[PDB]
């Protein structure tokens, strides 16, 4: 039954269950025949190399609070970047990436920062 | 220990330290409640 | 082959580790790996 | 195996399965050792 489920969930689709498909964020599996049994060749994503960064749940442009739509805030030390969770790619924190919620007073950990607005250059230019 | 400091990542491979308050933002993200809920009521949630 | 012997010891739980937990820092991986592991399960007994 | 899955899925990550992690949109769980068994503290989200 477990085998069927694995075949059902792992082969037929990508299973969400942690450690169902093998250690790690599961990609996919290739079922293989065997005597009186089955063997699966799971393909799993495992993070290789890492780097520390300094984080804060938000940033204040105006004195208002910004949270990341997708990602977490980090900094190279000089500048703050927001990136995805499992593979590092920094991005310029713009309004396009961020969403509004509350003000600076409540936030815990929020840091002052500057958010880039793509609109301004269009009108001024 | 890994659950507290690293989040879920410790299951996948190398555990990655992440501040706890951040984790709930993810965890709330897991349910369909955006991160803004947690921080906006961070103290209460912790107390609860 | 040398002066080999049988040893008994308190089994190691593994290399012990620790995570640099902090209010303000995250560990985000730069690169990853695509690995493959084998999970084996019995399907059927011999039809005796 | 059920227990392992609970640690595997529920502890190591956050489970999507309704009524797997305790009544509610599941947040997280902390296992606690016990004699010949294990106790989980499923922390779940429920609307008030």
UniProtKB/Swiss-Prot annotation, chain C:
Source organism, top-level taxon: Viruses
Sugar-modified residues: 23, 31
Function as written in the Swiss-Prot or TrEMBL entry: Precursor of the fusion protein processed in the biosynthesis of the S protein and the formation of virus particle. Mediates fusion of the virion and cellular membranes by functioning as a class I viral fusion protein. Contains two viral fusion peptides that are unmasked after cleavage. The S2/S2' cleavage occurs during virus entry at the cell membrane by host TMPRSS2 or during endocytosis by host CSTL.
Annotated protein name in UniProt: Spike protein S2
Source organism of this protein record: Severe acute respiratory syndrome coronavirus 2
Taxonomic lineage of the native organism: Viruses, Riboviria, Orthornavirae, Pisuviricota, Pisoniviricetes
Gene that this sequence comes from: S
Residues of the full protein shown: 687 to 734 of 1273
């Amino acid at each position: 039954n477990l085998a069927a489920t694995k075949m059902s969930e792992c082969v037929l689709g990508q299973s969400k269950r942690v450690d169902f498909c093998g250690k790690g964020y599961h990609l996919m599996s290739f079922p293989q025949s065997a005597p009186h049994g089955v063997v699966f060749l799971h393909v799993t994503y495992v993070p290789a190399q890492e780097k520390n960064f300094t984080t804060a749940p938000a940033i204040c442009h105006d004195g208002k609070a910004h949270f990341p739509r997708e990602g977490v805030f980090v900094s190279n030390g000089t500048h703050w970047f927001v990136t995805q969770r499992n593979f590092y790619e920094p991005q310029i924190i713009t309004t396009d990436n961020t969403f509004v919620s509350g003000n600076c007073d409540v936030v815990i950990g929020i840091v002052n920062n500057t958010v880039y607005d793509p609109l301004q250059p269009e009108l001024d230019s | 220990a890994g659950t507290i400091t690293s989040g879920w990542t410790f299951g996948a491979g190398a555990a990655l330290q992440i501040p706890f308050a951040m984790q709930m933002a993810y965890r709330f993200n897991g349910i369909g409640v955006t991160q803004n809920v947690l921080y906006e009521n961070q103290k209460l949630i912790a107390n609860q | 082959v040398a002066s080999q012997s049988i040893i008994a010891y308190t089994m190691s739980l593994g290399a012990e580790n620790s995570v640099a937990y902090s209010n303000n820092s995250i560990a985000i991986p730069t690169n990853f790996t695509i690995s493959v592991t084998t999970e084996i399960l019995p399907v059927s007994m011999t039809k005796t």
